[PDB]
Amino acid sequence: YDYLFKLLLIGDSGVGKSCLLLRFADDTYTESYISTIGVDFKIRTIELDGKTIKLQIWDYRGAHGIIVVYDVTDQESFNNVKQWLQEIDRYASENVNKLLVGNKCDLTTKKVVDYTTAKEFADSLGIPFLETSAKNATNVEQSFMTMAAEIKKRM
Numbered sequence: 201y202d203y204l205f206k207l208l209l210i211g212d213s214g215v216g217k218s219c220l221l222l223r224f225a226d227d228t229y230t231e232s233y234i235s236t237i238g239v240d241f242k243i244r245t246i247e248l249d250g251k252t253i254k255l256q257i258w259d260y261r262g263a264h265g266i267i268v269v270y271d272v273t274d275q276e277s278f279n280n281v282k283q284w285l286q287e288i289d290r291y292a293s294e295n296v297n298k299l300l301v302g303n304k305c306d307l308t309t310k311k312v313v314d315y316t317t318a319k320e321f322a323d324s325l326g327i328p329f330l331e332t333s334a335k336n337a338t339n340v341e342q343s344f345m346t347m348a349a350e351i352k353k354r355m
């Protein structure tokens with residue numbers, strides 16, 4: 201391994217953090233209600249720019265990057281991203297990497313959080329922004345890859 205990157209998923213309940221994490225780690229997905237992923241964390245290896253990188257993912261101070269998830273169909277969860285970053289400022293290495301994720305990009309009929317206005321926000325904060333679908337398996341890997349990229353960039 202070239203690096204070990206320790207990642208962390210924040211966000212409101214029902215956004216899909218557990219779905220994303222299990223999709224990404226295990227390639228599983230179920231509509232079924234997840235109380236908990238049964239295990240303290242997930243481990244996953246990826247290759248990137250010639251570099252083999254192990255990931256250790258939770259669902260604060262020892263995280264290299266934190267992913268702040270929200271739901272494109274829940275405007276409530278989007279507004280709360282604001283709080284979820286103040287948390288990061290309080291309990292996290294001062295330059296810990298950040299990525300904003302609007303899960304459930306697949307529910308377009310239900311989409312109330314305009315991509316363009318979430319993007320405009322992440323930009324305003326200087327953060328990368330991706331829309332994902334744990335259900336369809338869309339952008340899920342782009343997301344974690346983008347996170348590695350950003351961490352490997354500060355180093």
Ligand SMILES: Nc1nc2c(ncn2[C@@H]2O[C@H](COP(=O)(O)OP(=O)(O)O)[C@@H](O)[C@H]2O)c(=O)[nH]1
Nearest residue numbers: 212213214215216217218219231304333334335
């Ligand atoms: N349509 C769709 N539904 C999703 C997606 N991700 C999660 N869900 C559903 O939304 C619920 C919330 O997922 P969960 O991962 O437990 O959210 P968490 O509590 O924030 O970790 C689940 O019961 C899923 O069926 C997605 O990408 N697309």
Ligand SMILES: [Mg+2]
Nearest residue numbers: 217218234235
């Ligand atoms: Mg969960």
